[PDB]
Amino acid sequence: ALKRKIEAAKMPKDAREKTEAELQKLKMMSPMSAEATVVRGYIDWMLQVPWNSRSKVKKDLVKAQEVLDTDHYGLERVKDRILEYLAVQSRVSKIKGPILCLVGPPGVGKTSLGQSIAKATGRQYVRMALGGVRDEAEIRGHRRTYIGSMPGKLIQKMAKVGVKNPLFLLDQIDKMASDMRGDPASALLEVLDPEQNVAFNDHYLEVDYDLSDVMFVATSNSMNIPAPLLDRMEVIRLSGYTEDEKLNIAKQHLLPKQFERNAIKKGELTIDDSAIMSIIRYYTREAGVRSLEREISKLCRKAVKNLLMDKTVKHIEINGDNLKDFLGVQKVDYGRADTENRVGQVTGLAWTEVGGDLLTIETACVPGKGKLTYTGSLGEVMQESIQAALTVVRARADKLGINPDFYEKRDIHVHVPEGATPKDGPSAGIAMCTALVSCLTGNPVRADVAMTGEITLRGLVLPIGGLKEKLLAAHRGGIKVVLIPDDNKRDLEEIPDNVIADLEIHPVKRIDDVLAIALEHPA
Amino acid sequence: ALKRKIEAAKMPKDAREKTEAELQKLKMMSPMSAEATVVRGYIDWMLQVPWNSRSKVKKDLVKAQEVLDTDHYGLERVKDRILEYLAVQSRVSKIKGPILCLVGPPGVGKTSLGQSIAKATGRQYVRMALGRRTYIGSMPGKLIQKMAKVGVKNPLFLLDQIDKMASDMRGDPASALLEVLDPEQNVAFNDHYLEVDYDLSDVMFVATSNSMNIPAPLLDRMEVIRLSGYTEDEKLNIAKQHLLPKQFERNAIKKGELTIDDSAIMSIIRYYTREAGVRSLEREISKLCRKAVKNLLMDKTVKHIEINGDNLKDFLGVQKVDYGRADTENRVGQVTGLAWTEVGGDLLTIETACVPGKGKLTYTGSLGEVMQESIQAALTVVRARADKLGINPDFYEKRDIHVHVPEGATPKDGPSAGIAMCTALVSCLTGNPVRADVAMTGEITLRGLVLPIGGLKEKLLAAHRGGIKVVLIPDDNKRDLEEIPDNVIADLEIHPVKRIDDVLAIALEHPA
């Protein structure tokens, strides 16, 4: 009969004894009954499960990085993490402890890393989308006594891949749903548990199945993973992409894929880097390269449509100047430096979740009474930093050349020009003071200087957050000199080489360094 | 057939007229049917239930002290309470009153105390993490299943994360576990799969939680033991004695190539992490060890990797957080208060500026309303004592006063640091520099008194880490000085005060 597959399957002894026992339940009942179909289908499920077929794991780290670098450009910390993983299992057999997790905003490429890690580790790739699952039976299945019963998707994908030790990409943990009568977060805890891997105990397969050799890479957008599951994972947050590495994703990965996708032969469409930088700067904002992929795709479609309805040109050269004819009007814009030194204007720096941008801070004091107004949709910490910097300027006023009764005879207005954008934080502190000093002295602020740093009443410049986006933003906007708190200079080692080589960065301890560098005339 | 197995364990008589009842029913049925699989299963799920074979519980308390101290460093009050429970457990053979509960933030080792208690009492460990016979086949209940798997009559039982058990959804009510916890309803716990009453007495119960958000039928029976946050010397002693070897064995690092110094661990605790427990420290140490393994495979020239306080920027990235230090390099018109929080302690510098003006009073730095009330109270103390401090008393209308605390976008609230702000006001009004080596804490009243505060230990460890030499505490917190480590007492010159005159005598460098 079929004893050669039970014996040749080389199962563990419990699976072997109950499959052989269940065949010795099979061979004295009629094959047209329902029970022979139940135990026959159960034997076939037990035969197609990968009990011992195990794939070979790679051990090289140079070639594994060469595999990881031909699908993705700049996820250097994640690639280093996978090389640490492959470094560790060249000593031990099975890694114990937490599993991998990839948290990021949409479009950063944390689902298309599954094939990259499965190629770099030499392991077979299995993906399971968990975006709307409600019942535990997608993880654990149903009992053998039910009529249309079968294992869950876990055992069915192990049998679908036919090889133990695969790589799993649990696609969306943070999108799972709860329900009565069962919950796949508990069953998924039973999947991810290192002291429950060897005894999984599926409902259809009442044997224990070993899941300790399977690699677990799970993926999410937020930190809304449940606390039974989030404390068994290792969160690697993928941040946004800078403009230069978005340019490199576009040049090296997105442009040939979209030329192949819209079927563009050689020599009928070229796109230089000025057009792509105009897409990143003027037409997209998001963190990720999916919308950049869509704008490249519509450049390719408009190239095709402009080719087969003209039949005279056979080549279209898109650059930064004729991009308006294809994409349209520039939907967004970034801040730039002023071309001449103004008397009440300093360039602050700002950080958002999609990058940074230049702020403008414009003060104007007129002859008046004691009154002082703040406009520009400011938060309480921002305004509170303005009046803190104000009492910095009220002290040391004769040192700065300021008539010290000015607060009882000048009206001071502070305005950031954007109006409808909420702007909060202390990081525009030492810029703010500067503008006040400038409007109280007539000393014009030189327009090459960007400033960041919170201020205290004795004049110290305390650290900030999000420096790299502010330096890339200031380097984008033609700023030459930036001022920084001193103990942010550690973060200067994680800046690219052209930004360090093109900016004149001055570490600053006290407000007198700020007023010595950022003003045109001596104080 | 199976009769020597059912008499081989000597089950109680009720369960053997049940077991012999389905045995004589099994004599009158077909063997190969699935109903006989239910019958043989029901026989099998009673001969695994531990009707006997207890574990001999241990009665001495010195070997229990050291076998508690062999896996956990500094939970001394918890270990005291466990040895007291083993003392009454030594005299009273069956404690069925309340149940031990371990409340504390995540990161401290309240779950592995089930292991240390488990081999400390001598009994067997079954962990329960919370967060009827028929034709299709049924497993027994979870409470009974753990018992059968363990196969012992006296197994320690843990109810982990009852704060995460009772959710806002339809789940388990309080019934099926308080009927386990109560003393009179445990002589007959009829499991629904077996319909046979099984005893639950002489079974130790330990329940762990992260808060007191426990259901009201359960909080009546749970002794709330609190587990405070670990100090930095304790985290160093936990990393060096219990946490580096488990990462070395789960990474297979033999002892010759990797050396993680003490300044490296203190650099991780101070510069790279902020939590109450030692979990994030283990993510940093595990990352450090796997980077050592990667740096041994990718370079066969060097073999020994030395990691210290300097080369933790080559590894682990750059310094994520930072702590406050004493500004000892100069003595100026600001003070150094003390701030308490869940992660630990923090220095809290407080700045004032008093310029000529109309008497405007500006308070700045995301201050809570109780702090602003303490500034107004402290300024009233200064106005009531204006002549004898040497202040021209018209400063309420002739000088504008600004009180700033430097970490903006950090919400700060609390009645403490009132005498600190009074010291800063007397300082900036008199032109008398506050000496920088003095940290301060306390609560000011209009009569000039100093009222007690809370969290004195973390304020003293923050002040000891910051480089402060002299600490001014209230008088009624001398009591809390009975639980400070003596290196911190030996390094800090602690002055308990009771008025503002004792404060201004010490904290100002010139006499007033």
């Binding site: 149903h142 039910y146 009529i147 249309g148 019963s149 | 034709y135 299709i136």
Partner: peptide
């Protein structure tokens, strides 16, 4: 015996 999903 047959399973049946209820809402």
């Amino acid at each position: 015996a047959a399973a049946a999903a209820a809402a």
